[PDB]
């Protein structure tokens, strides 16, 4: 199967925002994050009303291209062998700066995902920020090998039921800023 990427703002009005970290930069035009391997990628959760406690936030990668859409995205054999003792070595996406990160493997599809409890916004902020880290380069042969991926962020209840969904393309690369410019120029 292929995980849905259909935007679903849902009853809480769930949207994503993005911040400069260049460790991490987001193109609204491309709906695409460009980021460096292992660096901080701040992703903002915006809601119109507050989800209940017990609400959870999952991140999962999938291949964008139809020829690989059913394939599990995971770290290349090299980077697998390179943890914090939290993230399983195979998992492409980690969360940093959170004591309650769950690393999950689907029973049926073998897809990886990383889940944290939903927290309402901190002081000074209208949104909740999660700091992801991507642990393998888009160009790694024997992994992504240049195939684009999407990260899907799902808001869920405690039983795993869908409350909201949004998604963004990701390229993990040496110079996010330069690569963003190159891809945005190919637009005009
Ligand atoms: Zn790699």
Swiss-Prot record:
User: Effect of altering residue 94 to S?
Assistant: In a sporadic cancer; somatic mutation
| Effect upon mutating residue 121 to L | In sporadic cancers; somatic mutation
Q: What is the effect of changing residue 116 to M?
A: In sporadic cancers; somatic mutation
Q: What is the effect of changing residue 151 to N?
A: In sporadic cancers; somatic mutation
Outcome of altering residue 14 to S? In sporadic cancers; somatic mutation
Impact of mutating residue 88 to H? In a sporadic cancer; somatic mutation
Outcome of mutating residue 105 to E: In sporadic cancers; somatic mutation
Q: What is the effect of changing residue 72 to A?
A: In sporadic cancers; somatic mutation
Q: What is the effect of changing residue 137 to D?
A: In sporadic cancers; somatic mutation
Q: What is the effect of changing residue 144 to T?
A: In sporadic cancers; somatic mutation
Q: Specify the effect of residue 22 to L.
A: In a sporadic cancer; somatic mutation
What would changing residue 103 to N do, according to UniProt? In sporadic cancers; somatic mutation
UniProt effect for mutating residue 130 to S: In sporadic cancers; somatic mutation; does not induce SNAI1 degradation
Phenotypic consequence of residue 182 to I: In sporadic cancers; somatic mutation
- Effect the entry attributes to changing residue 94 to L: In sporadic cancers; somatic mutation
Note the effect listed for residue 76 to W. Answer: In sporadic cancers; somatic mutation
Q: What is this protein called?
A: Cellular tumor antigen p53
Give the shown range, full length included. Answer: 96 to 290 of 393
